[PDB]
């Protein structure tokens, strides 16, 4: 099976540089063109660049807005395609995907998030959401930067009834919530705890939800 996996995304300052990697496996992709496409809320999908994966030689094409700022390259020996980004701007913020193209966009990676900002890396505050057949409990993950966070419940052993909502953004701080529904007979008599990770600040928090 074909596998594409992006990496290298994170916070980076305006004017700064950042190298993304795309590692591909499955079969010989010489007929394909590796494309970088970024997703923002504003633009939707936006084309960045591509490179022919021919072994004989390469050909590259670039979006007007990245010309002279970004270079695309590939190392066949590492089964990798790279996007070197430089002189980064706020508009470069987004999820960067590599995709193998031949006539159509055949295979896609899971993406890597690039945040172009000079704002402070802020770990989350994690607050319990308790009620003031079944009962809905929650987890407020307030005031972190940059994205993302991850939320689990009882270390993933509570998976059914779990909804994690999109973050909102205010004053360079994100906030999201996660809810879980469990039987009224099982809470509070069995403990329910959310587990939040914020990779950017190497943060992990566990918050037990108690009645109040």
């Amino acid at each position: 099976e074909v596998k594409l996996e992006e990496s290298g995304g994170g916070l980076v300052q305006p004017g700064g540089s950042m190298k993304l990697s795309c590692v591909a496996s499955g079969f010989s992709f010489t007929n394909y063109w590796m494309n970088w496409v970024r997703q923002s809320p504003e633009k939707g999908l936006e084309w960045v660049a591509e490179i022919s994966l021919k072994s004989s030689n390469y050909v590259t094409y670039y979006a007007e807005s990245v010309k002279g700022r970004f270079t695309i390259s590939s190392d066949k020996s590492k089964r990798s395609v790279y996007l070197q980004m430089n002189n980064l701007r706020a508009e470069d913020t987004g999820i960067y995907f590599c995709s193998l193209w031949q006539t159509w966009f055949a295979y896609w990676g899971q993406g890597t998030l690039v945040t172009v900002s000079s704002a402070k890396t802020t770990p989350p505050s994690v607050y319990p959401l308790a009620p003031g057949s079944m009962v809905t409990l929650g987890c407020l993950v307030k005031g972190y930067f940059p994205e993302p966070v991850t939320v689990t419940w009882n270390s993933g052993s509570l998976s059914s009834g779990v909804h994690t909502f999109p973050a909102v953004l205010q004053s360079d701080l994100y906030t999201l919530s996660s809810s879980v529904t469990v039987p009224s007979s099982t809470w509070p008599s069995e403990t329910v705890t959310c587990n939040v990770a914020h990779p950017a600040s190497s943060t992990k928090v566990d918050k037990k939800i108690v009645p109040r």
Binding site: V37, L45, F105, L129, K142, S177
Partner: protein, 213 residues
């Protein structure tokens, strides 16, 4: 520099035909623009559907076809299914660069209507220690994925300090959203009743809390 534009939203039902279009600001779309169509499903699951205007990728169901209709590129679903509820992007080639359109949200009314489950949470005492108060209104298991959220404090509409997320797909293909009412801790103590009102398909579901509980 060409701007590629698409319908922002269309609705169809199972078994019906629907056509999405894709305009180029530079003029008529031609086969020289080698129109591509990409489907985005939730959690960034992308599928290439069409390349070179009308060439369907292997694995893509026969009900999808690409074409040029008038001066535009077009994607047609002849016999739409519930699983086709997704975002569809077109991309046009201009000799040495690709340009994506803004995408079309296709709604396919295959699922039964589902009213939102609403839950309103008060501020945590831990948060109140920071002199801040956030009420969280969770909204789940609704279909179709459109809601209006209104807040009240002490029976009065709030026009300030509110933040609602766009509906996003749940794993079960219903929709969820969350809304936040942000107050100072003191504001929280100067008011008694708080209400989150979710309107969905003309029908309102209200949840409220009283500081007396």
């Amino acid at each position: 520099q060409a701007v590629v534009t698409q319908e922002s939203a269309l609705t169809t039902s199972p078994g019906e035909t629907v056509t999405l279009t894709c305009r180029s600001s530079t003029g008529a779309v031609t086969t020289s623009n080698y129109a591509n169509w990409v489907q985005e499903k939730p959690d960034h699951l992308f599928t290439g559907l069409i390349g070179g205007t009308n060439n369907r990728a292997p694995g893509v169901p026969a009900r999808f076809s690409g074409s040029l209709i008038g001066d535009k590129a077009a994607l047609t679903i002849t016999g739409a299914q519930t699983d086709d509820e997704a975002i569809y992007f077109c991309a046009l080639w201009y000799s040495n660069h690709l340009v994506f359109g803004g995408g079309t949200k296709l709604t396919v009314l295959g699922q039964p209507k589902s009213s939102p489950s609403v839950t309103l949470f008060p501020p945590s005492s831990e948060e109140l220690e920071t002199n801040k108060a956030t009420l969280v209104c969770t909204i789940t298991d609704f279909y179709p994925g459109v809601v209006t959220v209104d807040w009240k404090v002490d029976g009065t509409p709030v026009t300030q300090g509110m933040e609602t997320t766009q509906p996003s797909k749940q794993s079960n293909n219903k929709y969820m959203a969350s809304s936040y009412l942000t107050l100072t801790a003191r504001a929280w103590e100067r008011h008694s009743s708080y209400s989150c009102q979710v309107t969905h398909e003309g029908h309102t579901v209200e949840k409220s809390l009283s500081r007396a509980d």
